[PDB]
Structure formats: structure tokens, C-alpha cells
Amino acid sequence: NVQASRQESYTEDFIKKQIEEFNIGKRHLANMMGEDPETFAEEDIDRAIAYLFPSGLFEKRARPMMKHPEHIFPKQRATQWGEDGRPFHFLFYTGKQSYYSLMHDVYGKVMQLEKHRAESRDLIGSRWLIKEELEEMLVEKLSDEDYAQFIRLLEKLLTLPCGPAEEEFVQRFRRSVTIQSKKQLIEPVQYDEQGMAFSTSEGRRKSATAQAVVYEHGSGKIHVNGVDYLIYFPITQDREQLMFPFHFLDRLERHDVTCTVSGGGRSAQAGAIRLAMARALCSFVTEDEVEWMRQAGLLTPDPRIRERKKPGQEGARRKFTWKKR
Amino acid sequence: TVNRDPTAAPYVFHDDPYLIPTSALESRSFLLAKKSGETAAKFIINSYPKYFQKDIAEPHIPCLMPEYFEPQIEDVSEAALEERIRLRKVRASVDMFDQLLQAGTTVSLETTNSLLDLLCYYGDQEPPADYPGPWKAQNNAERIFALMPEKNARSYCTMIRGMVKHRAYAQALNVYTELLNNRLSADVYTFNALIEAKTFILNEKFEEKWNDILDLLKHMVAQKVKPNLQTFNTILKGLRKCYSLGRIPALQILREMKHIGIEPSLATYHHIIHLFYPRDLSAIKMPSLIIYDIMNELEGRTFSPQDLDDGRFFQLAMSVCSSLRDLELAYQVHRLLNTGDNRKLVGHDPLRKVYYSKFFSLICSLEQIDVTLKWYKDLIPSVFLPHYQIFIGLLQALDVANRLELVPQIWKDSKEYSHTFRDALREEVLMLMARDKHPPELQVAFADCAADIKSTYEDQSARQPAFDWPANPLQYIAVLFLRGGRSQEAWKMLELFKKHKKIPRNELLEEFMDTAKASGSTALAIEVVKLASAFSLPIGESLAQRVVMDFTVDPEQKEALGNLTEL
Amino acid sequence: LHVDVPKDVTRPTITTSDEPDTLYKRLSILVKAHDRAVLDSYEYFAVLAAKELGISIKVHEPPRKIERFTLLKSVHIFKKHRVQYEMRTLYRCLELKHLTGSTASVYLEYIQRNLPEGVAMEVTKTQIQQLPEHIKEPMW
Amino acid sequence: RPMRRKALPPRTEKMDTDQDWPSVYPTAAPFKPSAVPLPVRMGYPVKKGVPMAKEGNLELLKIPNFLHLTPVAIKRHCAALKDFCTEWPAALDSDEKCEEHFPVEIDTADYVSSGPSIRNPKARAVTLRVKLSSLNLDNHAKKKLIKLVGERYCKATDVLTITTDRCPLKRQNYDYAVYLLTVLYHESWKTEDWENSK
Amino acid sequence: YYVDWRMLRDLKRRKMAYEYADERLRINSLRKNTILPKDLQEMAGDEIAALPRDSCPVRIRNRCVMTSRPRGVKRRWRLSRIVFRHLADHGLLSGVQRAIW
């Protein structure tokens, strides 16, 4: 008994009407955009809505949407009993009919395997589904203790002898682990009008950006912005930074590089070239060497950039003096 | 590129379900409150102009600036009089003109004529306006005309026109005689007013009257004055009085119009139609065929406003089509309205609803139901909101096509147009639905419609204590409930015959009994007997005997039934 | 309309003059807006409109501009506490080529009249003409 | 006793799926939930809630909709607008071909903004660009023309740029730049006695 | 009624400087050069002084158009920081948002 509106819940009759309007919505949206209604799809709908209702709101949940009711409306709002009031599932009164119905099946499988009576690593590089994924399969809220108990039961199933039916079952709750390989992506090897091989790669340090063009065969002649490298870089430390890629792979005096660095200062421009050269030099080295470069810092872009000044303090971190009290 | 939206009201009306005109009254009332707010705003702007004078619009917009109508020239000079004449003030200009004469300062004949034009046209009365007329023998116009030292053709011409406009036909003709005696020459506009005068005056002999009007035309050629469209339009409008004898003269005029080179306008045909197709025409046996020829002549042509009766043509043409019961001609007339921008000459508010009402009524009568329903969606509501009689014609058409499945939908449409509480319409909907039997699905649909029409009676009864349920609707609503799986509701409605003291019909009473036999409920069968006894209907006794044989009556029922039989 | 359709719609009068027409080598249309999505819809509408009239069009996105300024948060004192505000301007350049003067007026009118609210245009016509008759021949 | 008016059902219900939508939205109008037959929703949704509906939606009203501009309308619109367009001369099929016959390039700028005033000060400026190769200039003339114009001449492109914004209107600034070219050209050909002392 | 008596005085200063703009331009031109005799320049130095003080355009102060606040005004909108924040924080200024970066 409060002014806050009563819980808004959706019946099967309500969602059913929301799906008829959506189906009639598609036929109108198709007629607007001049497309054929039969083939009009979810992808075309989202594109049409973006043209007819251009919104530049940064958060995409707040933009106009004409989606199917299944997506927008919470799925876990379906009638669980009939007209006579008798629930449909024998575990209705537990409050977690779907979680306990699943724990009922897995416990019955375990009993038959134990009564009836090889390597268990049938699948590798897989993980157990996270609670958020499980909650989606069950379509009901689970607690952290409920998730832990389900996994322990599934593990016990794997320990026991498993027929092909059991392996398919546990597969449903095994999700492929992401295979993000931190391995450098080698650039192609183009050919010049003369016919010499060369690779190109970009590099960015602070505000400086470089575009190197390493040549497979050379005597070590580096030209920066159409100038020599001793002239362009009068500082010793800046030249050393250009030496690091080649010296590491013992490839000094074997390549001819032509660089074009714009932006930043003297040190930031040398660093930008170093990464650009290291990435272009990848095409002319063995894969074992490319990994050696990656593990020495030569292929990682440096993310350190100047931080903004903050209002009310002298600098990015420097604070105004705390006046003597 | 764009066409009319069939599901939208006219663009003038605000696009909102709450603000869309339901009926024809709200259509006119909504366009009179809008104009009222426009006039309220212009009053504030024209009364406190200092607040609406800053101009920030480049280029400058003249029509969004305050208007000033009061003279700002204070000195009494011929120039100041000219300002008042330009501003169209009649009394102020007369005062300053007389003051100029009192001083004796020279006044140009052209300026004195601009004063007479204003006075003659407004007939000595201030221009009509809104804020928080026969010719008078003693008036400023005639007095100023006499004071004029030097007279010219225009001066006499202005007097002749102002007199005719303000119903001074006899005097205007006398003024024209003076113009001839002075040997001056009139203009086309003055000749048109003189012809309008002879016609309006009632001459005992038409042959003399016609020969007189022709004499004015003969003096138009002696003075080398060429006629215009209005000249011929005026003559034909006068001929509409003598329908019988004006037919041959009227055709002769139109042939002369083309030879001269004047192009007949929509107004010129509007007059010939009236003269050949009289509304009060007893001789309908053999109507004239001229309307067919005109439509062929005007087929595909585009027309522009060139007279003051152009709008009248389309409304008159549709009327003649309905009288002749020719739907092919109605399509040609409507097709002409669609060519180019002819739609602009359909007519104003009084005549726009007559044209389409006449048109749509003709469609339903003489058009296939499939085509009739296409026109129904196009014209309504976008073009016009129809009155209830339009729906009675539509429902009658549905009945003639054996498509009564659509009667429930027509009712829902009718409610939007303010026919929800119309007694005649509610009686027609129920009548057609319950006139004959139907398949179970159709009967169930009609039953839902019957429930909706019942709610209108119930809600109406709640508002009005002195409410009467007409007898026929009661029978129709009860029958439909029995036939469509709503028998329980029909038994409750049986009591309403007694509450309103309406005499149940013999057919309805026996129908209730038939349903009772299938149900097998003797109690329900005896309930019918109770109502028959109330109104002392003779069949009630026979019905009671019928119940005795139809059902086995318990001893308690025998005593109760016997009492009712005695009653 | 299902059965009721105009018969001979009236069309505007276009009269060919005897004056020669302007020749625009290039015509750059720089539209500006706070919202990128609006530019995408206008970019689609303008590119589709150009293609339908036979005009040659290219599109690129000039770098966006963001202007930031600081204000004082409190009505009184409390200097160190500020509030910052920004305005973002986004650009879409429609580079048209080889347009006569009649084609550039009708196209610009059509797309200028349909310019959404909050969008500003900057047309930069580039006309090409012959040399002045005096300059053609050196005269002393 | 007082009677409150009842709103009619939205006219979207009466709209067919094969309607002529261009007729529904002829020109730019605000989003009208009673005229747009689409179940569109907009708004960040509350927890366990869906985005708000179209009816009474201020966010959808704040959007500059393109319902008036649909692919079906635009094609029907441009079809009518074809009679206005004129054909570009086929011979001028390349940029170099244009420089051959029409060496003079005149830049003029228009500006479109929202407000009561159509005035922009930047619209008066005009810029003339001509290549000296296109001009008939003797070896003496070209050297004199390049010294007089100063930084207006670009050696890399050999283009002379005359920008005139001093006059109030665009027709005056345009006529002035053409004038500047004639005097510079004719003066360059003229030879003065003091020039022999270079 | 303007916001306060200070805004009214400034409004008059702005309307009298517009009246005397041409005059103060022509006379002041005679002084901002080295081509005319110093006797004439000294005399124009006195004609400019003789014009009314409110004709001088350096006595105009930019004040918030809605609250007549002398300082804290933003010239692009002619509003004080306090009034500008009320309109910006409510979505009433077209394109103004908070700066997060």
C-alpha cells in the first residue's frame, strides 16, 4: 500500500499481443523503406530505425528500438499454472523449479553410473559456464551457493564412467574458453617497381606517428623524412633507439629503412620510429625471433600519454599548496 | 508527388486524436475558434503596436508588422483628404472634403472621384469591421456629386455602380440617362451594372424586358466598348428566373461568347445548368441531355477563378447527376475536379459537404459494394465527416449485397463521427442484423455488436431519468442475444419489457420458448408466461399450455404455473 | 488513395532561357551538427538524392571539434570547485563535381530545405569561366 | 455533470500495410505517435523494465525524424526534380580539359543557419584563382606579374590567387577581383623606363 | 522595467555611444596621426573631451542580460555563470553538455 506503482508483470496474453503488433510493425517499416516484407529481417529493422530516427546518444540502450518482444521483455514472466490452479511442474512449490529440476536429473545420472560399475579429458581448453550464463539457461535467479553446488555435482559426474550421452550433457554446460593469442600479426611483403621486397608498418609514441618502410636488402641506410638519421637525430640516445630493433636481431647493416615521422618531440619521434621499424622488420624474421621481439618490449605500443590538467589543482597530480593553518 | 492521406483529417485540423473533429459541427466550431484566436492576437498587435515594432528579420517581412489604419496627416489639405480616401474612412473623408469646400481650396477632379468611389462602393457607411443599407436620397454621395464643379465620365459611372450595388436600380438608370445627354462614354463595368438593374427590376412583359437588356448591349457597340466575361455571366444569371423561355436565349449567348473570344468559365455553365435542369422540375420523364455535352466539352480542361460563381458549378453538377441516377456522369464530374487544381473550386463549407454527400450517396446506390467500400475509405474522414443518413445508406447497400458481416464494423466507424447515440442509426444496425438467421460464427459477431449498442442505451438511460427504451430495439437486442450464445443476458432483458412497459411481440415470446425447450429448464419456460400475463396477451394462455406438454412440471410448478395461467 | 487519384497533376513551369549557364567545377557542402547520427541520415539522403539526379558525389568526415570551457560551481566563493562544459561539432563534407548552375540550384534547394534542425550548411561553389575579353589580347 | 471529451482511437489502426507512406509524412513534421504505425520505443529502461513506449514520449519528440525522407519518397521526389537540371558539357570530361577552355576559377560561399536573419558577413568574400600558364605572358610580363602580386603567386602550382572582400556585396567583390586581374595583366606588359635599371 | 537601475544606466551608455560613434571617430582620427599640425591636434584633443562622458565607449560594461550581474558573464550568450548553468544543466541550451574526459 504505497504510491509506487504495483509490480508491472506481463501475462502470456500481453506478450502475445505485443508480438502481433511487432509483426504488423515490420510490414509497415518494410513498406516505408521500400523493401520486401517477406525477407525483411532483424538486421534491416535496426538499420531502418537508425535512419528514420537518428539519435546521437552515446549510450545505445537509450536509443530508439523496434525489437521483437522476446528480446526487450524479461523472459522469466510466463504463466506457471493452468486455469484450475494446478502448477505445471512437479517442483513448482520449491521456488526454483528449473534449478532443482536440473539438479534432479544430474543426481539421477550419477546414481546410475555409480550403480552400473579411462581418461576424462575429452574436452580441453573449456570452462564451466559462469553463473550469468547458467541463470540464462534456467531462466531463473540463482545464488552464489547454488552455482557452486551445481558445479560440484557436474564434476562428480565426470569423475564417474561416462557414456556418450553423459558427455553430451556435460558439454551443454561447458563453454569454449577464449583463445586470445598474443602473437604478432606479420605484415605482407610488397614489391617495388625495381622489384625489391619491402614491408611497411606504423608506430605511435606520445603524439608522434611514424610510417617505416623497411627493405629486405640494404646496407643500413636509414632516412628520416628524406634526411639522414645522423642529421635528423643529433642526439645519441635518439639514434640508439633506432638501433635497438636491428641490434637485437643481429641484423645491423642488412636493411634499408625509409621513415616519415610527423608530430611529437625528438624523443617521442625516435620511439615512434622504433616501433614502426620493429613491426615492419617482422616480415623478414623467423617466428621464433618475432616472439623474442615481443618479449623484449619492441612490439608493444607504449600507452603512456600526458594526463589532463584538473580544475582546482596546479597540474594533473600536483595540488595547490595547502594554506598554512 | 504526394497525395491525400485517406486516414487523416484535413490539414487545417490539428493532428491529434483528442483534437480531431468528430462531427461536422466540431469541424466548423474548431475552425471558428482558431480564427477567433487569430483575431484576438491581431487585436493585441494592432492596439499595442509599440511592443511589436522591433524588426529582426532579414529580409524584412512586411506582413508581420503592425497595421495602422488611422490617418496621421493632421493638416486640412487635398493631400490629407487623399490619405483618408486611401485608408477608406468614409465619414472622416466627407468631413475633410466639406471643410476643403468651406475654405474653397481647389480639389482635383481625380481626387473628388476617389472620394465618390469610396462613398459609392460603401454606400455612405463605414467599412464593416469587428472590435470590442439601401441608397438614401439625402446622402453624402449624391450631395458631393452635385457640388462637383466639373464632371467626367468616371464620376457618373461611379454613381451608377454604387446605386446598383446598394439596390438603387431606378435611380441608377436615371443617372445613366444624364451620362448620355452629356455625351460621355461609359465603361464595361457600368454597362454590367445597368444590365443587372434591368433584370432585377420586374418588367410586366418579358419580350420588352429582353429587348431592353439587348438595347444596352447595342449601346456597348455604338460606344466602342467591348464586353467581358462578367457581362455575359450577368445576363445568364438573370435568365434563371424564366426557365421555360430562357433556354433558346441562353444557348445563343454562349455561342456569341466563343465568337467574340471570351472563354466560358465554370460560372457560365453553372447558369446554363440551372436554366435547363430546374430543381423544382415536375417534368422528370424526359430530362435534357445538355449536361452530357458540357462534360465532354470540359473534359480535361483546367479552370481558374475568373468569376464569383465558379465554386457553384461543381455542387450543381453533382446534384443533376443524382437526379438522373447516372453514376458514369458522376465519375466524369469528379474526374474533372481532379484534373490540375480544379479541386479549389469545389465550393465553401456549405457547398463542399453537399457535393460529396450527393456523390457518396450516389456511389452506394449505384456502385458495386467492393468499389463502394473503396470510395468510403478515401472520402471519409479525409474529405468530409458524413452525417448519420450517409451510414443508413451504407448499411442499406451492405444489405443489398448480402454482406452483413461488415455491419458490425460500420457501427464502430459511426461512433467516431458522433452517431453513437443516434436513435435512427442504432435501430437500423440491430434491425438488419436480426432480420434473418445466420451461421453460428456470424451470429456470435452480431451478438457482440448488439451488446455494444445496448451499452449506449444503458449509459444514456443512466444520464436521463425520463428515458424511454424504444420497443423495436428491445426486441432486436434480445433476439440477437438468444441467437448468439448470450441467452442468459436475454432472460434479464425480458424484465426490461415490464420496467419500461413495452408490449412484447408475439414472435419474440415464442422464440424465448423454443430456446427453453432445448435447454430443458421449465423454470425459464414459466418466466415467459409471467410476462405474457402482465400484458394480458391472448397467446400467453396458449404458451402456458405449450409449456405443459414441452416439459414435465413438478407439483410445485403446477401450482405456480396454474396461478400464472389464471392470471 | 484506393480509387480516387489525381488525373493530370499540375507541374511547375520551367522555361529555358537564352543566357548561358554557369559551370561549377566543384561544390563543397560542409554540414555541421552536434549529432553524428543526424549527419549519417542526411549523408544518406543527400548521397541518394545526388545519385538520382545524375550528380557525382564523394563524402568524407572532417575531424570533429570539441570546445571546452570552465565555470565556477558555487554562487559564492569556493573557487577550487568548478564545472566544465563542452560543445561538440561534427562535420560531413559532400564534394560534388561537374555541375551546371541549374543543377546546383535545384539540388541545393532540395537538400537545404530538408536540413534537419541543429544542422548548419557551408556551401563553397567553385565556378569556372573564360578569360576576360580584354585580358585575352594584350593592348597597349 | 461535466463532460470530458473522449480521444478517438489512433489512426495508425486504420493504416494498411501497403499504404502510400510518402503521403502520410509529406514534409518535415514532429513525431506523432498517432500517425507513425510502428511500435517504436525509446528511453533507457529501468531495472526489470522495457524502454518507454511511443505515446507520450518526449525523447522521440526531441529527435529530428526522417519519416518525411524515405527511400521511396526521395526517388519520387528526384523524379520530378529532373526537369530542372541541365546537362554538363560532355567535352569537359577531365579537370585538365576544364583548365584548357575555362582557366579562371571563382570561389563563392553560401551559409545556411537557423534564425530570423539570413545575413552572414562571410558571404561577400570572393577568391579568384588563375594559372599564369593560361595567361599569354611574355618572359618580361611573367616576371613583372610575379613581382607585383607578391605572395599571391605560388611557384609550385603557378596559380595566382586574388581574394577580394573589401566591398560590401558579393557582386561587387567578384567584379573587383576580375578588375584586379586586368590591371595586373595589362600593367605587366607595359614596360616603364625605370625598369631598365633593375 | 529592466532588472535594476545599473542595467538601465548601462543601456543609456550604449545608446549614446551609438549616437556619437561617427563623431568620436572623425575627431579622434585627426589626433591619431603625425601628418597634421600639432595645433590642430591639440584642438581636436579638446573637442573630443567636450563630448558628453556617456558617449565614451569604455564606460560600457557587459552585464548578464537576465540578472544584470557585472562579472562572470560569458560573451557568447550574454549570461552570467550562474544563469548559464541553470539553462545548461537542464538541456535548454542546444548542444551544450557536461565535459567528461
Place this chain on the structure above:
Amino acid sequence: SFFTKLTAEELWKGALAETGAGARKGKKKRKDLNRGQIIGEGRSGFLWPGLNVPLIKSGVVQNIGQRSKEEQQKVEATMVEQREEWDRKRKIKVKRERGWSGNTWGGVSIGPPDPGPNGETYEDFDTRILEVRNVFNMTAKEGRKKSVRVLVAVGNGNGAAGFAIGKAADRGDAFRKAKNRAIHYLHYIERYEGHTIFHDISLRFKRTQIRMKKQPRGYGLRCHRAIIT
């Protein structure tokens, strides 16, 4: 200036000073000034067709007009009367019955309990208050928090009755909680011939002794005021 004018909601918010440092830790009354104003009505007395007067009268399309000085003075005085009458209406109220005293809640009817889950109305039941305690505890919200404990009883006068305690921070909430809780704890009391107990009853509940006696008809209820209720 027209630009320094604020809305009514903000003007009353400031004047009332409800949210303030003094209010929370320790009289002005709000008024609505648009209550009697009819759109289109001004001091000058202009008449606007379609806004404050009929658009059409006796078939005549009306035009703008203004009321005379005498007519307008009547309208101003009439509205002043209606405003004064509205103030009288605010003062007026329908007196309800007191309980065992005039300033106490004991014995006061608060109506029937609220409807049930499936439209189970309880119009046949009456609710009576027996004790109302305003007790203060010590929570950080106010330092010393506020609490209202309400004991109520319900019965249909036909043998079924129950009691419950409802606690809340607001008295109105404590009434609802107690009133709807008691409907779930309905005892059925056996009455001899519908007017008295079947036999003498003597009992001690904790330190409270009750001693009831069966009596003949017409004797009435001679009992503690709470027992009579």
C-alpha cells in the same frame, strides 16, 4: 523584469521553508492561486469567443467584446465571495465520534480492513483501537528515532473477532498494518443464545486478572471500557 519571475512551485517552496535546517532539528500554509481562475478571464473584463464565452450564440458568430465597469465589478465581487466560501469549506469538516476520551485513540473506529487478495471484502467487520503508543528509540537517522505502536481489534459482531499489533514510523501506516493483520487471526467466540458467555470465566494472564460472569438479558455490558469495545 519579466525574466526574473519564477513559477508557483518554486515560490511556495521557498516561502513555506519546509526543507530547512530549523525544520528538521527544530504557521505558514500553502495556497493554490489558480484554483478559481478560468482560462480567458482577466481584470480588464474582455470577452474572448471560443475561450471564456460561447463561440456561437443564438446562431450568431460572436465577436470580441468587453464587459462594462459595473458588470466587471460584479464578477470580481462574485469571485471574492467564492474564494471566501472556499475558505469556509476548508474550516468545515464532518465530526467523527470520540472514543473513551476526547483526546485519546482508544475506542475509535477506523473502518473495515482492506480487501483481500481475490477481492475478499470485509465490509461486515469493524475495527476499534485499544492502545496507541508513540515511542522513541535511538537510531542514527534522527538520533532519537520515532515509532508508533498501535493495538487494534476487529470483529463482525457475530462471534468472530481478532486483535493484532501494528508498528510503523507513521501512525496511519501502523493502523493499516494492525488492521489487516488482525483479520488473519480471527477467533470464534461461543455466545450462549447470542447475547452472553456460556459460564463464568476467571483467569490470570501474567499479572492481569479478569473475572467474567454470565448475566441475563437486559443486564448490559458492565465491564472495563476496553472489554465493552
Place this chain on the structure above:
Amino acid sequence: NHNTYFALMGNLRFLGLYRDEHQDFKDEQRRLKKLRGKGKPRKGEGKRA
């Protein structure tokens, strides 16, 4: 032009086409203040003679 806005809106309020919640708020505070005897004195008849 602050005079144009203040004057125009004041005129509209007297025609009944505009409602100033602020002014009605002030109009009633003066009415109540005058009843309490704290109303504005007449010019030339102030407390000081």
C-alpha cells in the same frame, strides 16, 4: 528590450490571455499585508514629517 517584455506580458495578463503565477503570488501578499495594516504609505504622508 526589458520594457517590451514586462509591458507586453502585463497587458496580456489583464486581457486574461496570460497567467503570471508570480504576480498572483505577489498580488495576494499585498492584499494580506494591507489587511494587517502594513500597507504602503501615501506619498508625502510618511512616518517622518
Place this chain on the structure above:
Amino acid sequence: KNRAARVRVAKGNKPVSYEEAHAPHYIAHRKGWLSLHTGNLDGEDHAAERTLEDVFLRKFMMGTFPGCLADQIVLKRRANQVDICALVLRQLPAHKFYFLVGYSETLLSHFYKCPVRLHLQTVPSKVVYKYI
């Protein structure tokens, strides 16, 4: 604590609309701009004049439709045209709206010397985004 344009929490009984619920930092993220003109774009003029005209147009519409506005109005300037889009409660009779539309449009077109149109969407009652 920041007090700017925040409808503070009550005890779950205050009905806030979508516009009212979102604080200033959600501008351009979850909620858009009520006025859309070209005067705050880069290298554009007359920001001061567009902002002042909006302030007046908002006070004018409130007084002209007193108690009949369900939410803040939306102002759209295209070329010299001004468009006012307001959600209005269905309190007043229909014909009264036709008067106020004709009056408010004509008056505002002669005051700012631009074409002004009023677009009114009628709601049965204020739309509540959440109860706070």
C-alpha cells in the same frame, strides 16, 4: 553534494518523468536537448539571441497553457521557422486548444518576425518514468 537539476529522493512516492529523473551528466548520453538550433555550432553566430528567445518562448507557453503542460516543450528551428512541440494534458475542451493555438502562433510570429507553428500532442495524464 551537487544540487543542480536533480530531483532528490523522497520515500518512493514522487513520480518523476524521464526528463526529470536524469541528472545533468546524462545530457547527450541518455536524454537529448530540448532546443535544437544552429547557434552553438562552431563558427556560428547569434547564440545569445537564440537563447533569449527560447527563455521567453518557454515562459509564454506556460502562461498561455496554465496547468495544461505535461512536460517541457521542445523547440525546433529550421531556416527562419520556429516549431514548438508540447505534450499537453487533456484538461481543456478541444475548441479551447484551437483558440490558444491560433492566438499563440499569430502573437509569436509578429513578435519575433518568423513563422511559428505549434504542435500539440495530447496525453491522458503525465507519463511517469519511475517513482522515486
Place this chain on the structure above:
RNA sequence: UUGGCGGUACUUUAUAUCCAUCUAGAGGAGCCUGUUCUAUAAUCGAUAAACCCCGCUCUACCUCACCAUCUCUUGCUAAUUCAGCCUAUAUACCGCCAUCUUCAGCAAACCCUAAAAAGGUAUUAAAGUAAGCAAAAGAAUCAAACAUAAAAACGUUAGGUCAAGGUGUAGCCAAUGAAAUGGGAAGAAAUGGGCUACAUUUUCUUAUAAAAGAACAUUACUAUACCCUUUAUGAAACUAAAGGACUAAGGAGGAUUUAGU
């Protein structure tokens, strides 16, 4: 039965922090700037943390609210025995904020208790439940992350602001209102913050931060002071900049304190 604070000083805890570690400063000199004090005919407010380059992203006149002197009395508006009021109370308030604070709580409606002043957890589970607000998430810094910004409820300080504006109550209406002219001064003073120098990792010059040639302790380094010229803005130079000399002190700054991962 609760709430509190007492000496919660005890165990873990903070993370540019309490001490320790590290770097550059402040504390000394010269100036710039705020405040207090003295003081003037001459604003006001802020004034421990959470004031002191604060309202001011800005005072030669204007700004201006201050003081002296002279003047106006229906005195901005359509109307009004009305206009106007920076007049007192931020201890009547709105509005917009500081603070604890990127702290983690605030918790409505129901249900249960051998009566409840209150409480309501156990997961191999024992009476709690299904929803909000903040956090998280999301979005912004235009790949990705991280980081930074932004966000941070309820209370605490009757904290700050009637002088952004609006407003309750009380006060002034020939004056506490309006306008004009000219002033709103200073320091053998204390203190907060900033700036420059004290030099050799330096000074000057050319390049450019590469390299080179000179200077290098009595004025070598070293005056954003005073003074002297020219110049820009302005009606007004009392302002700012650029030169010119004049050049004094200062030789790296006690206890002590600020910022930075």
C-alpha cells in the same frame, strides 16, 4: 532492553599516507597578490580543517554596492494611495555549493515470534521474502585495455551565500529611493600564497636546444622595485609592454610545513 561516549589508547588497517623512504619547494632576500592590523570622510561578503590570486575567467572613469558635496519627488512599466529599496534576519527559505566522500550504506511493502521495549542467520541451511535508492554496470576521453574524468544516496557542520536572482517576516517613502561631479588614501607592521634571483647542470651571442665563441666575484650572476625615455589602449595613463641607465639585497634559507606513486 537499548543507545551513547569514556582513555575504546588493543589487533589488522591508510597508500602520495600517520612515521620512514624519495624529489622539488615553503620558512631567509627582492618584489607580485590576498588577508589581518594600524588607519581613512570612504563598500560588503568569505575569514580552523572545509578563508587568505576567495565572489573577481579581473576596481584609472564606468564597474560601484562606499564617502563628501549639489540636485530630483508618480520618480523605467499597460494599470495601480503607486514606482523604487545591495535596508535587518543565510537562525524563515528557494537556488547553487563546501565538508566527511569514490565513505557504504539508505532501506518502502509483506511475512513470522508462547508479545514484539525488539528481532528475523545457519548453504550437508534452522523464517524470512519479493521490489527500489546509492555502489557496481553503463557511457565520455572518437580500437583495445588501464588510468583519468564524471558519478557518489541519507545524515554531519542552523557550514557559505538575502550583495547572481526570487522570496517569508519586519523596516524606509521629501528618503534607507533616483541622478550628477570629485574622492575611495597609506604603512620603520604581521602573515598566507605566488613570482624571480641567489649562478658554473651557470651568464651572453648564433643556432636551436645539437654544437661553437666569449663572460665567469665585486657588482661576474643579479631588480617584473624606484627613477628616465619611447610605444600600445583610452576622452582621460593613474595601466601594460619595450629600451635606458641606476643598480641594492641575496651566497640556497631555524623549529617547522606543502605536493607528488
